[PDB]
C-alpha cells in the first residue's frame, strides 16, 4: 500500500498528479560526480522517534547514504546532547544542535554530518528556541530552520510574519554574500494550493493563511531563492506532513511543509530534490537533496 501515490486534493488542476518516488526520481548520477546528499526531516521529538520500534539509524543510513542529516523538533535541552552524541552511529563524527533555553522540551534543531563544517553558528549566538543552524561548506552555506509555528486561532502570526520572517530572510541574504545558501528544515507554510489536500478548508489555519503564503514569496522565493521540489516537479502532488488527529496519512490527506530552497546560483546544480513518504516515525516524512558540486 502506496497511499502517497494516490492523488487526494479537494481541487485538484485538470493535469495534476500524485508524487511517485519509485517513478519520478530522475536517474542516477553518473558514478564519481562529486555531490553532496542531503537529508531533512521534522522528527517530531527525537528520543520519541528513538524509542520507534521500527527505526534504525544504521539502516536509514545505509539505505540514503547520506552526507548530512537536518532535524527539526529535536526537543532536546542543552544538558542532553552529551549523551544524544554518544549514540550518534558510526560514520557521522560532526554533530551542531541548539535547543530551546526559554521554553524546554521545544523546538530544537540539529545537523548532523560525515563532512567536517568549515565553521556552524547557531542562530542569527542568541537562538532562544533552537530554531537555525548554519555550517558553512567549501562552496555553501547549509541552513537548517525550524520556522516558528502560527498557531491556533493565529496567535502567534504577528511575530511570525512581522519579525521571524525578516529575520530568516536577513540572514540568508546576507550569508549568500559570501557563498549560496541551501536553507532547509520545516518551513511551516504551504506556498500554494498544490502544497495542501484542503485549502479552502484552511484559508484561516496556521500555515496556510494568505499572510504566510505572501511572505514566503516575497522574503524567500523572490529574493532569490528556489523551491526545488516544486521547480523539479511542476503539477505534482506531494506533501511531507500529515496531521495525526484526523488520520490523514492513511489517504495522503497532508501538507507540504518541509523544503529545499536554494540559492538561483545553485539551482541548475540540483540532481534531485525528493521525498521519501514510506518512512513512520513522527508525523513528517524525510525528504532529501542531492546537489552537484
Same mark, same amino acid.
Given at each position: 500500500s502506496e497511499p502517497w501515490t494516490v492523488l487526494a486534493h479537494k481541487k485538484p488542476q485538470k493535469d495534476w498528479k500524485a508524487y511517485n518516488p519509485k517513478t519520478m526520481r530522475p536517474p542516477?548520477?553518473?558514478? !564519481?560526480?562529486k555531490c553532496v546528499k542531503v537529508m531533512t526531516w521534522n522528527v517530531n521529538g527525537l528520543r520519541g522517534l528513538l524509542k $520507534? &520500534?521500527?527505526?534504525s539509524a544504521l539502516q536509514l543510513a545505509q539505505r540514503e547514504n547520506f552526507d548530512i542529516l537536518c532535524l527539526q523538533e529535536? @526537543?532536546?535541552? %542543552? @544538558?542532553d546532547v552529551e549523551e544524544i552524541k554518544k549514540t550518534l552511529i558510526d560514520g557521522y563524527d560532526h554533530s551542531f544542535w541548539s535547543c530551546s %533555553?526559554? /521554553? *524546554?522540551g521545544y523546538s530544537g534543531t540539529a545537523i548532523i554530518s560525515r563532512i567536517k563544517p568549515l565553521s556552524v553558528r547557531y542562530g542569527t549566538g542568541h537562538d532562544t528556541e533552537g530554531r537555525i543552524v548554519t555550517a558553512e561548506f567549501d562552496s555553501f552555506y547549509l541552513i537548517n530552520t525550524y520556522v516558528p509555528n502560527s498557531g491556533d486561532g493565529l496567535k502567534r502570526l504577528s511575530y511570525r510574519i512581522e519579525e521571524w520572517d525578516r529575520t530568516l530572510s536577513n540572514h540568508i541574504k546576507e550569508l549568500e554574500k559570501s557563498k549560496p545558501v541551501v536553507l532547509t528544515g520545516? *518551513? =511551516?507554510?504551504?506556498? &500554494? &494550493? #498544490?502544497?495542501? $489536500?484542503?485549502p479552502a478548508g484552511n484559508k484561516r489555519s496556521a500555515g496556510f493563511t494568505i499572510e504566510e503564503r505572501q511572505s514566503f514569496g516575497? =522574503? *524567500? *522565493?523572490? /529574493?532569490? $531563492? %528556489?523551491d526545488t521540489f516544486r521547480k523539479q516537479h511542476p503539477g505534482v502532488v506531494g506533501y511531507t506532513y500529515w496531521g495525526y488527529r484526523h488520520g490523514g496519512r492513511k489517504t495522503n @490527506? !497532508?501538507?507540504?511543509?518541509?523544503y529545499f530552497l536554494v540559492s538561483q546560483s545553485i539551482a541548475? =546544480? %540540483?540532481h534531485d530534490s525528493y #521525498?521519501?513518504?514510506?518512512? =513512520? !516515525?513522527?508525523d513528517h516524512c524525510p525528504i532529501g537533496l542531492i546537489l552537484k558540486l
Open positions: 542516477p548520477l553518473p558514478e !564519481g560526480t $520507534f &520500534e521500527s527505526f529535536t @526537543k532536546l535541552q %542543552v @544538558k %533555553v526559554s /521554553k *524546554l520545516d *518551513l =511551516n507554510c504551504a506556498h &500554494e &494550493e #498544490i502544497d495542501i $489536500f484542503n516575497a =522574503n *524567500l *522565493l523572490d /529574493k532569490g $531563492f %528556489v @490527506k !497532508g501538507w507540504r511543509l518541509d541548475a =546544480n %540540483v #521525498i521519501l513518504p514510506d518512512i =513512520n !516515525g513522527s
